[model samples]
Target: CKQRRRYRGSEEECRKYAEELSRRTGCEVEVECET
Candidate 1:
């Protein structure tokens, strides 16, 4: 199933969520940067 979620929080908190998601789902997680 395809799922979409949004996060508007601190970088650290977002990263923590991403890490947990990746760990639980065994999927690669990427964070974007402006620079």
Candidate 2:
């Protein structure tokens, strides 16, 4: 399954989500964000 997710929120929020994601997968992920 391959899907691209977009985030238009705070960097902190993104980080939080990313962290949880990191926890779930325990795998490497690539994220792209904008301010």
TM-scores of all predicted structures: 0.53, 0.55
Q: Which has the greatest lDDT? A: 2
Candidate 2 overall lDDT versus native: 0.64
Candidate 2's residue-wise lDDT over 1-35, tens digit each?
A: 23335666789877876676666775765455666
Overall lDDT per candidate, in order of appearance: 0.61, 0.64
- Identify the runs in model 1 with alpha carbons over 4 angstroms from their true place: 1-4, 31-35
TM-score of 2: 0.55
Clashing pairs in 1: none
**What's every prediction's RMSD, in angstroms?**
4.6, 3.0
Model 2 clash number:
0
Name the best candidate (by TM-score).
2
Candidate 1 lowest-lDDT run of ten: 26-35
lDDT of 1 at 22: 70
Q: What is the lDDT, from 0 to 100, of the residue 6 in candidate 2? A: 61
